[PDB]
Write a protein that holds these residues in place. Sequence first.
Motif, short mmCIF file in Angstrom:
data_model
loop_
_atom_site.label_atom_id
_atom_site.label_comp_id
_atom_site.label_asym_id
_atom_site.label_seq_id
_atom_site.Cartn_x
_atom_site.Cartn_y
_atom_site.Cartn_z
N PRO A 23 0.80 -1.24 0.00
CA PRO A 23 0.00 0.00 0.00
C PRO A 23 0.82 1.27 0.00
CG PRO A 23 -0.14 -1.15 2.12
CD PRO A 23 0.46 -2.11 1.13
N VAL A 24 1.96 1.31 0.71
CA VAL A 24 2.77 2.54 0.68
C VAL A 24 3.30 2.79 -0.73
CG1 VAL A 24 4.79 3.74 1.55
CG2 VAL A 24 3.35 2.39 3.13
N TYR A 49 -3.22 13.26 1.48
CA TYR A 49 -1.83 12.81 1.44
C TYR A 49 -0.95 13.91 0.87
CZ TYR A 49 -2.90 8.06 2.83
OH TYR A 49 -3.22 6.93 3.58
N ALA A 328 4.81 6.90 7.15
CA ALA A 328 3.83 7.98 7.18
C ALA A 328 3.58 8.36 8.62
CB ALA A 328 2.51 7.60 6.49
N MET A 352 -2.07 13.26 5.96
CA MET A 352 -1.06 12.20 6.05
C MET A 352 0.21 12.69 5.38
SD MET A 352 -2.51 9.49 7.59
CE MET A 352 -1.04 8.48 7.44
#
Length: 454
Positions: A23-24, A49, A328, A352
Amino acid sequence: KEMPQPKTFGELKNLPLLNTDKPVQALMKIADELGEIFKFEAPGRVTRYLSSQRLIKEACDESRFDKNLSQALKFVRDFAGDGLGTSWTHEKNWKKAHNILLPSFSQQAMKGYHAMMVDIAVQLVQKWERLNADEHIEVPEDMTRLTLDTIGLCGFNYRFNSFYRDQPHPFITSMVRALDEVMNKLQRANPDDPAYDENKRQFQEDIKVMNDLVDKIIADRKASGEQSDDLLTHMLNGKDPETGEPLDDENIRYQIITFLIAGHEVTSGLLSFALYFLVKNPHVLQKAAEEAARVLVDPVPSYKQVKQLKYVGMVLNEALRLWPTVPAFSLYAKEDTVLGGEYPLEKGDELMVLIPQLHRDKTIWGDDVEEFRPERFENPSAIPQHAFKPFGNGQRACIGQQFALHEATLVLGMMLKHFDFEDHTNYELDIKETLTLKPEGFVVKAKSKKIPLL
Ligand code: HEM
Ligand SMILES: O=C(CCCCCn1ccnc1)N[C@@H](Cc1ccccc1)C(=O)O
């Protein structure tokens, strides 16, 4: 300006984008496509983000933004409680534990930890000295043995003895399985599906294990009266200067759990990525190994010699630039404000900070952002404000930063002094994602320079 948003899935909004092995890295790809800010929505959630230094330097203004508990941290808080990492800044136990623990985590305290760190580092070197001719090293695995043992010993005078075993410690089995459940729970499109009742039962059992084992560690120390100079003694004997109060036993347990999470694969990731970049960049490896030989002139390094491993420290920061192992952190607006003169935020709105993407901002680092060049870190005054945030921000920054960098500099220096390294498989980087990052399957061969430890 209206900020972009990645592709949506009807009522699930962007959530299915997180149902992916990496996911990152998926979020970094979205940032590549959409730019310095994008909205990300899920059922009952909205965040933004950030990936540019231009905006993140404003987000790091502590008068305007405070640490937020991401969904990941909210779930981790189920077993890390109001430990330092999972408490809100306004919780009484954050400031109390912060005040008590800061002196345990300073450079001065590292002088006290050094001999215990050396103990484990020497075990790592001795393992590699004892491998046979064409055997190889499983890098993340061995780094994790090192990091875990080091926090066990410096944390509460406990030897995990990870170099003596393959099977993980029962505490670690439950902690990793709990962290695995957190990641899975972030990806579920309907978390209330009864198909997950078994996962939830196991999650509660793994929390019970972690609590039982750590509560017994503390009870045993209180029953023996021993005064080891470790974090647990400091927590049992320390008093908050502000309130005058000590930590209670429940909160001490949360702190220990929190340190064990941090000192496990989060810290070993840094070593694994640093060794990956060194073997992929032989001139950097040579330069670092020349420093290690020049500085580490005794059989075992002193505290002062570790401080003199300047280039090794630059290697570690450049590994943290490309693959920061806490990828994060979250923030919320304390009042209405505007970001970058273009993005109005309301009090409470959350952000984020996508750290790996921040560290690839070409306006800061130049066009060669993907290259491994420790020299970028020669001069901290030449680095713009909030361009480099692997340890977070402000009063909520990583309390363990000096601990992590000292233990990583020590062992990496010893590795470079004692061995020549071969990338015998031409390893293709494959970053496995948990709540942290590691180079999965990274292997090397280490040929001894035959320099003794006696
Ligand atoms: C390379 C290794 C490490 C990295 C990259 C790292 C990074 C970070 C980051 C980014 C944060 C902020 C999280 C947020 O804002 O939500 C943080 C907080 C924290 N870290 Fe680490 N960390 C590392 C190792 C460690 C170690 C070894 C310890 C302790 C043994 C530790 C203990 C903590 C604690 C207690 C906090 C919360 C501090 C507070 O909010 O009062 N970390 N770390
Ligand atoms: O912020 C985080 C949590 C980062 C770890 C915080 C510290 N720590 C480490 C182990 N325990 C807690 N992760 C990102 C990326 C992600 C998305 C979905 C699933 C996994 C990872 C996000 O949530 O946006």
